C-alpha cells in the first residue's frame, strides 16, 4: 500500500501529488530549501499526527488537498526533545522505570551498586554489568525476562552510537544529534507498529564508523511494521534506501518538485535529472584541495582533562583549515567548545566564561580575535529575520524612502520598519498575526485580518520600487533579491555572501524563530565572510554541515577556504568526509567514545590520517582521497 499526498502546496511545493510506499525505508533527498521538510514534516507528519489526535476526547491543517493511506505519525528531529531539566537519559528512554521494578524485585543493591550507582555507569558498562549477573537461581525467575527487556533497550542505545552516555546524564545537556538518536532508540525499543516515522538527518553527530549500525536500526524500525521516512544527505543511507524521493531541482523558488522517484539502482542508471544522482554516480564531486596549507605559527593548549580528555596537549596550527574528528563521545566538543573556546575568549576578549580543566595555553598572542559560529538562533522573536540580522534591511528601507513617491508622502526609512510605529500595522504589532487573550497557555496565533499577514498598513504598502512593495521584498528569497538588487552594491554584497554560504533559498523575512540551527549558523558565517580586514581571527564551528546536501557542502567548503585564504584560522568539528578531506590539518580523538576515548589518536594532513591504522576517521578518509 501507499501514502498518496494530493496537491501538496506547503511553502515552495508546486502543488504536487506523490505516492510513497508504506512499510519501506524511504529516503528524501535534495538540496537545502528544495522542500524536503515541507513535504515530510509539514505535510505528512503533521497531518498524520493531527488525524490521530482528532480521535481524542473534546477534540492546523497544512496546505494540501488530501492524503490517502495516512497513518498516525511520529517525528524524530531536534525539536522533539525534552525541556524538563529533571529528565535524564534514563527517564526519556523509559529504562529507569524498568530499573525501578528490577530493584524492587531484588533489593536495595545489586552486585554492590544501588540504582543511582547503576545509572552512573556508561551504557556499555551497564550492559556488561547486567550480562555478568547470575547472583541467584530463583531471583532469575522473578526478573529474568525483565532483564532481557532492559538489555534490549540498552542495546538500542549502543546501536545509535550512544554507548558512552550514562543513564544519569541530564537530558538537557545532550546535543541535538544525541537527542535525536536517543528518541530513535526509545521509539524502536517501544515496539510500536503501524506508524509513519519521519526522521530528520539521524546521522547528525554520528561518525561514519557507526553509519552501518544506524542503517540496520532504521531497517529494524521498518521491519516492526512501520513506514520510515528519512530526510538524509549521507551517501550510505541514501544507497540503503528501499525508495528514494529526490526533491528539486533546486532550492527556494527553483525547488518544490519531485525530480526523481524510485530505487537506488534506478537513480544511478539515470542521474542527469538530479544533482543527488550526479553526485552519487561520480559525475559531480566535491574536490580535494591539492595544495595543503602550512601554518604561520601555532598555539597550544596543555593539560586538558575536561570530561574524558586524557591530560592531552593539543597544538592548533594557525592560518590553516583545522578539523577535529573522532567517533562520538571521543571528546571533540569537550576539547574545542567547552575548553579551548572559553579559554581563548577569556584570554583575548573579556573573560569570565567557565572553561574545562586544563593547565595552560601558549601562543594565543598569534591570533587577534576568537569568534564562535554556532547553531544558537539569530534572534528569539519573529521581529528578527535574515534581512535585519545581516542588516541589509536598513539599506532596503533607505532605498524605499528614496523613491519619489515616498519622498512626496513624507515617508522616511523608519516608515518601512515593522519594528517602529508609523508604517507597520498597529493591530498586529508589525508581525502579521494576533493571539486570543486567554489566560496564559499556548494560544492560537491567527493571521491578522487587517493586514492579511503583510506586516504594514495599506498606506505604506502603496510605495513600490520596481513594482515591489516592502512586504514583497520581505517575501523574496535571497537569490531573487540578489537578482532584484544586483545594481545596489551594498545590498548585493550582503545578499551575495548569503548565497555563497548556501542560503539563496531563504526568504528575507523568514522569522528567526523558524530557522534551523544550521541555517542560523550559516547566516552568522555569511556575516563574518562579509566583513573586511578580519586578519588573524580564529573561527570555531561545530558540525557546520547539518542539513547540507552535497552541493551545499561544496559551497560551505569554498567559504571556509575563503576565510582561511584571507589569513584567518578555522577549526571545525566534523564527521563529514567531504569537509575533512579538505582540511589542512586534522586532530583525531578517540579511539572510542567515553572512558576509552579522549586520547589524541592521530594528527596531520588527511593523507597522513588516512595512513594511520589506529584512526577510524583515517579508515574512511582512505576511500575519498
Ligand atoms: N517556517 C517557514 N516559513 C516560511 N518559509 C519557510 C519556512 N520553512 C521553510 N521555508 C521555505 O520553504 C522552502 C522549502 O524549505 P524546507 O522545506 O525547509 O527545505 P528543505 O527541508 O528541503 O531544506 C525554502 O525556500 C524555505 O526557505
Ligand atoms: N554534561 C556533559 N556534557 C558533555 N559531555 C559530557 C557531560 N557529562 C559527561 N560527558 C561526557 O564527556 C565525554 C566526551 O563527550 P563529548 O565531548 O560530548 O564528545 P564528542 O563531542 O566527541 O561527541 C563523553 O563520555 C560524554 O558522555
Ligand atoms: Zn496586521
XYZ file of C-alpha atoms and ligand atoms in Angstrom:
680
model
C 0.000 0.000 0.000
C 0.926 3.633 -0.409
C 0.644 7.078 1.042
C -0.821 9.354 -1.628
C -0.149 13.036 -0.975
C -2.529 15.022 -3.227
C -1.984 18.691 -4.053
C 0.833 19.496 -1.636
C 1.435 23.283 -1.645
C 3.153 23.954 1.707
C 5.789 26.685 1.200
C 7.515 26.153 -2.159
C 5.873 22.806 -3.023
C 4.447 23.111 -6.540
C 1.007 21.537 -5.941
C 2.472 18.055 -6.272
C 0.933 14.590 -5.965
C 3.366 11.988 -4.602
C 2.921 8.274 -3.937
C 5.118 6.804 -1.199
C 5.375 3.050 -0.483
C 4.441 2.091 3.080
C 6.451 -0.222 5.337
C 9.617 0.768 3.476
C 12.768 2.751 4.197
C 12.097 5.890 2.126
C 14.937 8.416 1.871
C 14.043 12.003 0.888
C 16.978 13.814 -0.702
C 17.618 17.150 -2.363
C 19.447 20.438 -1.862
C 18.681 22.700 1.082
C 15.438 24.522 0.625
C 14.203 22.129 -2.061
C 11.204 21.260 0.122
C 12.165 18.019 1.888
C 10.886 19.179 5.307
C 7.848 20.904 3.739
C 6.769 17.530 2.304
C 7.866 15.104 5.016
C 7.394 17.168 8.206
C 4.960 19.996 7.484
C 2.675 17.804 5.330
C 2.910 14.051 6.034
C 3.948 14.036 9.721
C 1.738 16.996 10.659
C -1.384 15.567 9.040
C -0.811 12.018 10.338
C -0.424 13.257 13.889
C -3.375 15.650 13.510
C -5.731 12.986 12.198
C -4.873 10.703 15.082
C -5.229 13.457 17.716
C -8.662 14.412 16.388
C -9.845 11.000 17.747
C -9.164 12.075 21.347
C -11.624 13.482 23.883
C -13.040 17.024 23.464
C -11.084 17.121 20.162
C -3.646 23.399 11.887
C -4.237 21.555 8.586
C -1.357 22.101 6.110
C -1.886 23.485 2.627
C -2.672 20.155 0.930
C -5.775 18.717 -0.728
C -5.865 15.192 0.701
C -3.621 12.354 1.880
C -4.726 8.774 1.221
C -3.234 5.887 3.172
C -2.191 8.103 6.075
C -1.307 6.572 9.475
C -0.562 8.255 12.832
C 2.876 9.814 12.534
C 5.806 10.410 14.871
C 8.694 12.794 14.200
C 12.307 12.419 15.326
C 14.208 15.666 14.991
C 15.866 18.329 17.093
C 12.544 19.850 18.155
C 11.048 16.601 19.564
C 13.334 16.911 22.612
C 12.796 17.095 26.358
C 12.851 20.508 28.009
C 12.372 19.196 31.568
C 15.663 19.810 33.453
C 14.671 16.939 35.773
C 14.833 14.500 32.871
C 17.759 12.150 32.300
C 18.738 9.650 29.627
C 17.171 7.047 31.923
C 13.797 8.755 32.113
C 13.462 9.868 28.477
C 14.251 6.316 27.276
C 11.808 4.737 29.808
C 14.622 2.460 31.014
C 14.615 3.948 34.525
C 11.145 2.544 35.279
C 12.356 -0.921 34.306
C 15.338 -0.453 36.605
C 12.993 0.534 39.428
C 10.953 -2.647 39.022
C 14.201 -4.629 38.916
C 15.429 -3.108 42.181
C 12.023 -3.500 43.846
C 12.119 -7.198 42.906
C 15.610 -7.880 44.277
C 16.877 -5.362 46.818
C 18.495 -2.026 47.516
C 21.816 -3.110 45.993
C 22.510 -5.455 43.078
C 26.088 -6.783 42.909
C 27.316 -3.927 45.095
C 25.668 -0.934 43.403
C 22.416 0.831 44.209
C 20.175 2.057 41.369
C 21.692 5.544 41.160
C 25.156 3.976 41.003
C 23.962 1.731 38.169
C 22.647 4.704 36.182
C 26.070 6.398 36.557
C 27.828 3.648 34.592
C 28.055 4.158 30.845
C 25.606 2.223 28.665
C 28.251 -0.323 27.644
C 29.285 -0.766 31.294
C 25.632 -1.151 32.277
C 25.231 -3.853 29.627
C 28.336 -5.737 30.772
C 27.191 -5.423 34.384
C 23.783 -6.947 33.640
C 25.221 -9.690 31.416
C 27.709 -10.678 34.157
C 24.835 -11.212 36.596
C 23.875 -14.648 37.791
C 23.872 -13.951 41.507
C 20.821 -16.161 42.142
C 18.911 -19.171 40.842
C 15.353 -18.075 41.732
C 15.692 -14.290 41.540
C 16.281 -15.155 37.881
C 12.704 -16.471 37.754
C 11.395 -13.135 39.108
C 13.408 -10.701 36.937
C 14.748 -12.816 34.058
C 12.561 -11.699 31.169
C 12.666 -8.192 32.665
C 16.460 -8.116 32.405
C 16.074 -9.170 28.780
C 13.890 -6.129 28.133
C 16.346 -3.814 29.869
C 19.204 -5.325 27.879
C 17.237 -4.960 24.654
C 16.660 -1.280 25.281
C 20.267 -0.608 26.242
C 21.452 -2.377 23.089
C 19.378 0.031 21.021
C 21.266 2.923 22.633
C 24.541 1.263 21.659
C 23.097 0.816 18.186
C 22.596 4.547 17.696
C 26.141 5.337 18.762
C 25.448 6.367 22.376
C 27.220 3.649 24.399
C 29.331 6.281 26.169
C 26.345 8.044 27.785
C 25.221 7.241 31.312
C 21.562 6.850 32.246
C 22.180 9.530 34.905
C 23.154 12.104 32.247
C 20.802 15.108 32.246
C 18.695 15.175 29.064
C 19.147 18.914 28.613
C 22.941 18.583 28.393
C 22.726 16.387 25.242
C 23.477 17.740 21.778
C 20.794 17.794 19.086
C 22.187 14.699 17.385
C 22.347 12.835 20.674
C 18.728 13.804 21.435
C 17.514 12.621 18.015
C 19.189 9.271 18.391
C 18.009 8.833 21.986
C 14.478 9.250 20.687
C 15.160 6.792 17.859
C 16.417 4.208 20.367
C 13.363 4.806 22.568
C 10.892 4.502 19.694
C 12.370 1.281 18.404
C 12.512 -0.026 21.988
C 8.783 0.697 22.421
C 7.883 -1.781 19.669
C 5.077 0.409 18.315
C 3.916 -0.655 14.825
C 1.721 0.848 12.130
C 3.075 4.392 12.300
C 4.772 6.700 9.839
C 8.093 7.778 11.392
C 9.656 10.939 9.917
C 13.325 11.360 10.869
C 15.377 14.476 10.197
C 19.005 13.566 9.373
C 19.545 10.856 12.053
C 23.293 10.696 11.197
C 23.834 14.176 12.673
C 26.699 13.852 15.154
C 27.417 10.214 14.124
C 30.860 9.051 12.920
C 30.955 7.080 9.610
C 32.239 4.086 11.648
C 28.714 3.857 13.091
C 26.668 4.610 9.976
C 26.105 0.980 9.054
C 24.766 0.124 12.504
C 22.421 3.114 12.355
C 21.180 1.868 8.981
C 20.459 -1.570 10.465
C 18.496 0.152 13.228
C 16.414 2.110 10.725
C 15.647 -1.151 8.965
C 14.580 -2.789 12.217
C 12.258 0.139 12.802
C 10.834 -0.573 9.356
C 10.599 -4.302 9.967
C 8.397 -3.834 13.027
C 5.691 -2.805 10.559
C 6.299 0.915 10.121
C 6.900 3.339 7.317
C 10.269 5.015 7.938
C 10.762 8.320 6.092
C 14.279 9.711 6.476
C 15.428 13.136 5.258
C 19.117 12.464 4.687
C 22.179 13.661 2.818
C 24.552 10.821 3.769
C 25.594 8.740 0.747
C 25.415 5.358 2.523
C 21.960 5.968 3.986
C 20.764 7.018 0.519
C 22.300 3.871 -1.006
C 20.487 1.714 1.554
C 17.037 3.170 0.776
C 14.194 0.965 -0.408
C 12.797 4.025 -2.153
C 14.267 7.454 -2.947
C 12.269 10.681 -3.346
C 14.564 13.421 -4.681
C 13.226 16.990 -4.354
C 14.373 19.858 -6.526
C 15.514 20.684 -8.992
C 16.984 23.481 -6.860
C 16.083 25.336 -3.724
C 13.545 28.027 -2.953
C 11.518 29.147 -5.952
C 13.581 26.660 -8.019
C 12.541 23.745 -5.789
C 9.311 22.149 -4.573
C 9.168 19.353 -7.171
C 9.837 15.599 -7.085
C 12.503 15.327 -9.801
C 13.247 11.606 -9.241
C 11.463 8.737 -7.511
C 12.488 5.063 -7.423
C 15.226 2.708 -6.342
C 18.928 3.424 -5.841
C 19.801 1.397 -8.946
C 17.286 3.394 -10.997
C 18.813 6.647 -9.724
C 22.324 5.533 -10.690
C 21.050 4.410 -14.116
C 19.564 7.837 -14.984
C 21.143 10.535 -12.833
C 21.235 13.554 -15.160
C 17.916 14.946 -13.923
C 19.015 15.181 -10.264
C 22.020 16.699 -8.528
C 21.783 13.889 -5.977
C 22.185 11.353 -8.785
C 25.101 13.263 -10.322
C 26.982 13.181 -7.018
C 26.119 9.518 -6.395
C 27.380 8.491 -9.864
C 30.618 10.476 -9.693
C 29.563 12.878 -12.444
C 29.815 15.630 -9.798
C 32.318 15.811 -6.927
C 33.444 17.961 -4.029
C 37.106 18.484 -4.929
C 40.052 17.585 -2.699
C 42.259 20.644 -2.177
C 45.573 19.520 -3.634
C 47.650 22.361 -2.102
C 47.639 21.831 1.687
C 48.485 24.997 3.638
C 51.291 25.363 6.158
C 50.766 27.483 9.307
C 52.396 30.811 10.053
C 52.505 29.934 13.785
C 50.642 27.769 16.243
C 49.040 27.894 19.632
C 48.973 25.036 22.089
C 46.619 24.157 24.950
C 48.263 21.899 27.544
C 46.987 19.508 30.173
C 43.377 19.186 29.040
C 41.468 16.881 31.388
C 37.875 18.058 30.949
C 35.409 15.143 30.886
C 37.136 12.113 29.318
C 40.134 14.028 27.865
C 43.325 12.190 28.867
C 45.574 15.032 30.042
C 46.359 15.916 26.434
C 48.405 18.677 24.845
C 46.823 19.900 21.614
C 48.588 22.063 19.063
C 46.478 24.271 16.769
C 48.360 25.415 13.645
C 47.208 28.907 12.717
C 46.344 30.232 9.276
C 45.130 26.825 8.061
C 41.894 24.803 7.886
C 41.725 22.571 11.011
C 39.274 19.704 11.525
C 38.736 17.989 14.859
C 37.426 14.447 14.232
C 36.747 11.147 16.022
C 33.789 8.960 16.986
C 31.010 10.477 19.017
C 31.850 10.741 22.707
C 35.585 10.902 21.962
C 35.905 14.407 23.468
C 35.690 16.779 20.470
C 33.168 19.204 21.901
C 34.728 18.833 25.370
C 38.083 19.876 23.890
C 37.022 22.553 21.419
C 33.713 24.027 22.552
C 33.981 23.665 26.326
C 37.692 24.226 26.947
C 39.624 25.859 24.092
C 36.844 28.261 23.121
C 36.113 29.817 26.564
C 39.799 29.788 27.485
C 40.657 31.858 24.390
C 37.616 34.102 24.873
C 38.881 34.769 28.384
C 42.438 35.440 27.243
C 41.639 37.608 24.209
C 38.132 39.143 24.748
C 36.634 39.983 28.093
C 36.964 36.974 30.355
C 34.853 35.195 32.588
C 33.428 32.133 30.857
C 33.821 28.811 32.680
C 36.240 26.519 30.858
C 37.042 22.822 31.105
C 40.033 21.762 33.193
C 43.434 22.468 31.599
C 46.898 23.624 32.622
C 47.973 26.394 30.261
C 47.832 27.961 26.788
C 50.872 29.084 24.782
C 50.897 31.142 21.607
C 47.486 32.848 21.871
C 49.214 36.112 21.010
C 49.409 34.703 17.472
C 45.705 35.383 16.934
C 43.884 38.642 17.437
C 40.253 37.539 17.763
C 38.243 34.481 18.761
C 34.774 34.088 17.249
C 32.464 31.102 17.677
C 29.985 30.459 14.852
C 27.473 28.124 16.480
C 23.926 26.922 15.908
C 22.193 29.072 18.512
C 19.384 31.189 16.978
C 19.988 34.608 15.426
C 17.044 36.028 17.359
C 14.335 34.975 19.778
C 11.345 36.807 18.283
C 9.895 36.879 14.755
C 10.898 40.569 14.767
C 14.303 39.199 13.709
C 14.868 37.747 10.253
C 17.863 37.246 7.910
C 17.468 40.767 6.482
C 17.516 42.510 9.865
C 20.298 40.289 11.279
C 22.669 40.907 8.381
C 21.322 44.496 8.456
C 20.630 44.645 4.711
C 17.041 45.598 5.589
C 18.256 49.010 6.765
C 19.633 49.523 3.257
C 16.392 48.332 1.643
C 14.397 50.721 3.868
C 16.636 53.648 2.862
C 16.112 52.683 -0.778
C 12.338 52.677 -0.371
C 12.478 56.003 1.462
C 14.369 57.374 -1.523
C 11.658 56.639 -4.107
C 9.903 59.763 -5.461
C 6.582 58.530 -4.082
C 7.951 58.040 -0.547
C 9.663 61.435 -0.566
C 6.461 63.080 -1.753
C 4.466 61.355 1.004
C 6.966 62.351 3.714
C 7.973 58.710 4.410
C 11.458 58.352 5.863
C 13.155 54.985 6.211
C 11.546 54.380 9.639
C 8.190 54.203 7.864
C 9.409 50.953 6.267
C 10.399 49.294 9.576
C 7.922 46.792 11.027
C 9.545 47.409 14.451
C 8.538 51.104 14.668
C 5.127 52.737 14.802
C 4.104 54.634 11.687
C 4.218 52.301 8.701
C 3.730 48.964 10.440
C 0.268 47.522 11.031
C -0.525 48.613 14.579
C -3.171 45.918 15.146
C -0.675 43.073 14.723
C 2.372 44.927 16.197
C 4.084 44.678 12.813
C 4.126 40.866 12.848
C 1.101 39.697 10.813
C -0.748 37.621 13.417
C -2.692 38.121 16.647
C -3.402 35.899 19.647
C -6.536 35.176 21.678
C -6.390 36.701 25.144
C -6.982 33.595 27.231
C -5.071 33.435 30.426
C -1.669 32.144 29.766
C -1.169 28.922 27.798
C -0.002 28.493 24.138
C -2.877 30.325 22.426
C -3.802 30.217 18.741
C -1.913 32.697 16.525
C -4.408 33.599 13.793
C -3.379 35.678 10.793
C -4.082 39.378 11.175
C -7.244 40.047 9.185
C -6.381 43.752 8.797
C -3.040 43.409 7.026
C -3.546 39.796 5.829
C -0.062 38.945 7.126
C 1.832 41.642 5.194
C 3.042 43.447 8.401
C 2.447 47.039 7.171
C -0.587 49.265 6.853
C -2.117 49.712 3.413
C -0.697 53.260 3.000
C 2.908 52.046 3.399
C 2.258 49.143 1.015
C 1.335 51.602 -1.762
C 5.006 52.573 -2.152
C 6.690 50.348 -4.726
C 10.245 50.033 -6.016
C 10.297 48.326 -9.446
C 6.750 47.123 -8.833
C 7.531 45.626 -5.414
C 6.360 46.969 -2.070
C 8.300 46.414 1.175
C 6.211 43.338 2.023
C 7.129 41.903 -1.397
C 10.832 42.393 -0.634
C 10.461 40.507 2.648
C 8.853 37.655 0.680
C 11.812 37.358 -1.741
C 14.297 34.536 -1.365
C 17.921 35.646 -1.143
C 18.562 34.610 -4.776
C 15.505 36.508 -6.036
C 16.534 39.543 -4.021
C 20.151 39.162 -5.186
C 18.985 39.465 -8.797
C 16.459 42.197 -7.935
C 19.099 44.386 -6.225
C 22.118 43.441 -8.345
C 22.747 47.127 -9.163
C 22.949 48.222 -5.493
C 26.464 47.352 -4.269
C 25.956 47.387 -0.504
C 22.826 45.239 -0.792
C 24.262 42.900 -3.418
C 27.353 42.285 -1.254
C 25.321 41.019 1.728
C 22.931 39.007 -0.435
C 25.931 37.550 -2.277
C 27.533 36.183 0.892
C 24.175 34.705 1.935
C 24.061 32.982 -1.458
C 27.686 31.831 -1.170
C 27.099 30.059 2.176
C 24.200 28.203 0.533
C 21.198 30.225 1.815
C 19.920 31.502 -1.548
C 16.630 29.710 -0.845
C 15.931 31.577 2.413
C 13.355 34.341 2.384
C 14.493 37.755 3.616
C 11.597 37.973 6.072
C 11.583 34.393 7.390
C 11.178 34.845 11.159
C 14.275 33.983 13.178
C 12.328 31.517 15.319
C 11.573 29.299 12.326
C 15.197 28.946 11.214
C 17.067 25.708 11.861
C 20.238 25.797 13.917
C 22.261 25.117 10.788
C 20.587 27.995 8.959
C 21.312 30.320 11.898
C 24.948 29.188 11.892
C 25.308 29.790 8.144
C 23.737 33.273 8.430
C 26.320 34.114 11.082
C 29.010 32.617 8.842
C 27.896 34.867 5.966
C 28.053 37.866 8.315
C 31.672 37.026 9.134
C 32.513 36.439 5.480
C 31.096 39.867 4.596
C 33.469 41.664 6.970
C 36.748 43.142 5.804
C 40.213 43.020 7.377
C 39.479 40.141 9.746
C 43.121 39.072 9.575
C 44.120 36.736 12.412
C 40.681 35.693 13.630
C 40.179 32.129 14.829
C 36.679 30.863 13.972
C 35.279 27.739 15.673
C 32.317 25.949 14.034
C 30.587 22.878 15.474
C 29.246 20.497 12.789
C 28.503 23.152 10.136
C 27.254 20.521 7.614
C 23.987 19.789 9.486
C 21.222 19.994 6.908
C 23.586 20.182 3.917
C 23.291 18.278 0.652
C 26.415 17.516 -1.399
C 26.045 20.779 -3.343
C 25.556 22.768 -0.122
C 28.670 21.211 1.392
C 30.574 22.149 -1.787
C 29.551 25.757 -1.122
C 30.366 25.580 2.599
C 33.853 24.232 1.860
C 34.518 27.049 -0.648
C 33.518 29.597 2.017
C 35.737 28.042 4.684
C 38.738 28.052 2.307
C 37.950 31.709 1.615
C 38.103 32.571 5.310
C 41.431 30.779 5.666
C 42.768 32.325 2.433
C 42.365 35.832 3.838
C 44.522 34.993 6.868
C 42.026 33.513 9.371
C 42.126 30.184 11.170
C 39.132 27.849 11.054
C 38.524 24.930 13.444
C 35.529 22.751 12.643
C 34.226 19.735 14.497
C 33.064 17.381 11.768
C 32.177 13.845 10.786
C 31.609 14.816 7.140
C 34.352 13.340 4.978
C 33.963 15.878 2.173
C 34.881 18.576 4.688
C 37.557 16.515 6.446
C 39.293 15.573 3.181
C 39.673 19.346 2.616
C 41.350 20.050 5.980
C 44.938 21.286 6.091
C 45.321 19.639 9.487
C 43.311 17.079 11.426
C 43.252 16.327 15.139
C 41.626 12.917 15.579
C 40.406 11.964 19.057
C 39.399 8.630 20.500
C 39.897 5.815 19.676
C 36.392 5.081 21.093
C 33.920 7.283 22.990
C 33.692 7.625 26.789
C 36.367 6.156 29.069
C 38.137 4.588 26.060
C 38.253 7.911 24.202
C 39.821 11.252 24.984
C 43.242 10.406 23.552
C 44.809 12.012 20.518
C 44.888 9.059 18.143
C 46.352 10.888 15.116
C 47.291 14.328 13.770
C 48.459 15.637 10.364
C 47.101 16.090 6.836
C 44.189 13.997 5.502
C 46.791 11.868 3.731
C 48.696 11.242 6.978
C 45.488 10.434 8.902
C 44.483 8.043 6.113
C 47.774 6.185 6.560
C 47.186 5.723 10.306
C 45.717 2.264 11.066
C 44.645 3.401 14.578
C 42.231 6.050 13.236
C 38.634 5.186 12.339
C 38.451 8.565 10.608
C 41.532 7.683 8.572
C 39.977 4.331 7.672
C 37.091 6.108 5.946
C 39.171 9.040 4.661
C 41.220 6.416 2.775
C 38.319 5.869 0.357
C 37.742 9.532 -0.607
C 41.316 10.743 -1.150
N 8.607 28.211 8.584
C 8.765 28.720 7.337
N 8.176 29.861 6.926
C 8.345 30.360 5.682
N 9.113 29.763 4.745
C 9.763 28.607 5.037
C 9.621 28.010 6.367
N 10.366 26.890 6.387
C 10.938 26.750 5.162
N 10.574 27.788 4.368
C 10.988 27.989 2.972
O 10.363 26.958 2.195
C 11.273 26.458 1.204
C 11.462 24.965 1.493
O 12.074 24.840 2.796
P 12.285 23.423 3.525
O 11.032 22.615 3.331
O 12.778 23.635 4.924
O 13.500 22.832 2.669
P 14.432 21.556 2.984
O 13.768 20.755 4.057
O 14.408 20.842 1.662
O 15.807 22.140 3.314
C 12.568 27.244 1.393
O 12.578 28.339 0.468
C 12.492 27.786 2.813
O 13.226 28.996 2.981
N 27.314 17.393 30.775
C 28.084 16.851 29.812
N 28.258 17.447 28.603
C 29.027 16.909 27.634
N 29.689 15.749 27.775
C 29.587 15.066 28.920
C 28.770 15.578 30.051
N 28.844 14.711 31.091
C 29.665 13.730 30.626
N 30.103 13.934 29.332
C 30.996 13.010 28.562
O 32.243 13.516 28.069
C 32.744 12.577 27.101
C 33.139 13.303 25.819
O 31.946 13.876 25.277
P 31.897 14.942 24.059
O 32.960 15.974 24.228
O 30.441 15.342 24.031
O 32.209 14.027 22.783
P 32.068 14.395 21.221
O 31.957 15.901 21.137
O 33.329 13.866 20.589
O 30.872 13.606 20.734
C 31.588 11.624 26.802
O 31.837 10.430 27.554
C 30.364 12.317 27.356
O 29.336 11.382 27.713
Zn -1.516 43.341 10.845
